[PDB]
From a paper:
Mutations in the [name] gene were observed in more than half of human cancers.
In the crystal structures obtained by the soaking procedure referred as R273H-MQ (I) and [name]-MQ (I), bound MQ has been identified at residues: C182, C229, C275 and C277 in both structures, as well as at C273 in [name]-MQ (I). This conjugate is also incompatible with DNA binding. MQ-C275 in the structure of [name]-MQ (I) is close to the nearby MQ-C273 conjugate. C273 residue is unique among the [name] cysteins by being a result of a DNA-contact hotspot mutation common in human cancer. Interestingly, this residue is extensively modified in all eight monomers of the two [name]-MQ structures. In all monomers, a pivotal hydrogen bond is present between the tertiary amine of MQ and the amino group of K132, being further supported by the negatively charged E285 side chain. A common water molecule is anchoring several residues to form a stabilizing network of hydrogen bonds and CH···O interactions. These MQ-C273 conjugates are likely compatible with DNA binding as indicated by comparing the structure of an [name]-MQ monomer with that of wild-type [name] monomers interacting with DNA.
Author numbering:
A (entry chain A): 97 to 182, 186 to 289
B (entry chain D): 97 to 182, 185 to 223, 228 to 288
C (entry chain B): 97 to 287
D (entry chain C): 97 to 182, 186 to 288
């Protein structure tokens, strides 16, 4: 199973998320207490990259989903049969897409059969302190043919142009209709 | 500029404050005559919620800081760059107002106004108390820089409908007891 | 494992370091309490050599890094795969070597044929006109936190004074952190 | 030339000193009339920090010596060659050390070449009203090749974690064999 161990590494790599709140109209919202992103099917899911020093051009950022529970960790996370039968760049089986990036790259691992999506690292824009990638999750947590309500973790890895690992972080993910209500409910139960 | 007007609304919503006095040891103290809270950096600032009838479960209580002077009211109130680099794991580093001791605390960066606020669930008690922390001094250059602020406390239902609103002024300074006594002399 | 045992030897060989303090912007700074240098990736790290009597011409000054923890001491300290990738600023130095010397055209780098350890050596030069010490500017080419390299493990640098034929004359050592803000890391560690 | 202007600042920074008197046995004694400390070489010289409100954690306290006389003020105060010979954590050239503090930090200023010593500000223990720092002076005022009978001032500055001035005070210092007699004799004039 792919490592999920957090490493800030040489560049001080960590993730951040918008402080979106839990209003009914929010389409994605992150829970710091749960380290868990709540988002809507195929909607924009901003993840921020925070670094202490700037990685060189050529650095790449990879995202991969794995099942959190130990008895499902060896199963490849993929879309359900229904949603797979629905882009011109992403493989129809992949749960995680990146939108708004024409240099996006998709991988089916030839040995593990796991799916991942990678984009070029770009430094923050002029007035910004973080790089933002817009992920899309293409299947509901409740899709019976896929995750089937099993919790998943998204692993974000920073790697150089030769594939050497530079840092790693991760967050749990829920894909459901009303992420504001779901966040509020799950924090009530803790 | 977000609305600052007082409204007790349907539930008779008001704010209360402990009668802590101005002895040297006080870590925070409220002046009724100035409707002003004097507190210390990152120390407990208790605010009581008074209601004539209980809001339904799912009610929420929001706090937001705004500059009091009309020439500064459109500037977002945020921590100075020094303190923003100076976390509880839950709060954004730029936010002036935190809530301590509440694991269901939620923080908002408004996508369009860019203003900061902190919201907790309303819990029934004879008063509901929220422990706020103010994370930047009134005197911080680059932050409030000696400009007066108001904290706006809003009661909202679970759908975000406004139920009531109150407010108070706040000082964040090293000796709240001495500051209150001095300003009330003028 | 090469020796880290301090020995002033017959020339009274000692190390000195600038008294730089811990301001946030300082580029390197040494902690006497920790016998530890805090420096930045690829930036100047001055180390002073102090001798009681002047070593003969042909004397050489070697620097080598070793891991401090016993379960890693037989591992060669080297740059991580990421940083060991060749660059156009490598110059006179092997791309795998953690420790460089800057501003010295007579610098020499060694991959030991038998132990595979890396080291960098320069001629010993006596202090200039109105000076009491000789300064060498080292650069450390990999952060302490580099994945696939030091990977947060602590290291020592061993400075040896050698004769023209390589016999040990003197030896000292110090620990090294390579991090983004040495002033902060030192002030925080001394708490 | 560093500032010696007294500056109580926002925290109400003041110095205090023990009321030690001038008996023969005393090793450090302060003259209020002269604002001048009389202490022996390398012995404990206590200096109290008094504040009206507690400065934040991360505050630091710096000490630096300058020559009191205007015609010597640009000369760096340092130890004489005799005493400078190589001790613990301190640089051998530094006149002013701090005793009993593992977090002490010493600075040779890269631009002014001045020496100084810095420790973290600690608040007074609950019950106590002031913070004491134990300084040591490592050269006699009479040392040939060092101070050479020239009077010096010790400047104590309060700074925040980024080095910004919060407060400043100063006092004269005389390092000599018998501080009690020296103080008593100097107050006769
Ligand atoms: C992290 C960055 C910033 O500095 C602000 C908030 C979110 N992104 C874009 C603007
Ligand atoms: C040891 C030498 C000197 O005599 C001064 C201080 C540090 N180095 C360079 C100049
Ligand atoms: C700077 C180094 C490191 O990276 C860890 C923590 C402190 N030192 C020793 C090990
Ligand atoms: C240091 C003292 C003085 O002030 C003078 C000269 C030497 N001792 C005795 C008298
Ligand atoms: C997203 C949500 C679900 O639907 C189950 C897995 C994780 N989280 C809790 C239960
Ligand atoms: C808290 C105190 C200050 O520091 C200024 C703004 C508000 N109040 C009066 C002056
Ligand atoms: C980059 C690579 C080369 O091409 C030679 C010089 C340094 N490195 C090893 C050999
Ligand atoms: C310590 C670190 C910082 O935070 C900036 C100034 C100096 N150094 C590089 C960037
Ligand atoms: C602050 C000062 C005093 O007044 C006594 C107690 C502690 N310190 C030394 C003596
Ligand atoms: C210590 C004594 C001296 O030797 C001169 C300077 C200060 N004090 C008075 C004169
Ligand atoms: Zn599906
Ligand atoms: Zn501030
Ligand atoms: Zn590296
Ligand atoms: Zn002397």
């Amino acid at each position: 199973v792919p490592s999920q161990k957090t490493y800030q590494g040489s560049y001080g790599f960590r993730l951040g998320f918008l402080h979106s709140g839990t209003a009914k109209s929010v389409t994605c919202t992150y829970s710091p207490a749960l380290n868990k992103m709540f988002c809507q099917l195929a909607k924009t899911c901003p993840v921020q990259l925070w670094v202490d020093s700037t990685p060189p051009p050529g650095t790449r950022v990879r995202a991969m989903a794995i099942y959190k529970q130990s008895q499902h960790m060896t199963e490849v996370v993929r879309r359900c049969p229904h949603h797979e039968r629905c882009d011109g760049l992403a493989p129809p089986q992949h749960l995680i897409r990146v939108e708004g990036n024409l240099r996006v790259e998709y991988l089916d691992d030839r040995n593990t059969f796991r799916h991942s999506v990678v984009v070029p690292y770009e430094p923050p824009e002029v007035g910004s302190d973080c790089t933002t990638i817009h992920y899309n999750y293409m299947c509901n947590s409740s899709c019976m043919g896929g995750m089937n309500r099993r919790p998943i973790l998204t692993i974000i890895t920073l790697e150089d142009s030769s594939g050497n690992l530079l840092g790693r972080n991760s967050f749990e993910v829920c894909v459901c209709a009303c992420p504001g209500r779901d966040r509020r409910t799950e924090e009530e139960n803790l």
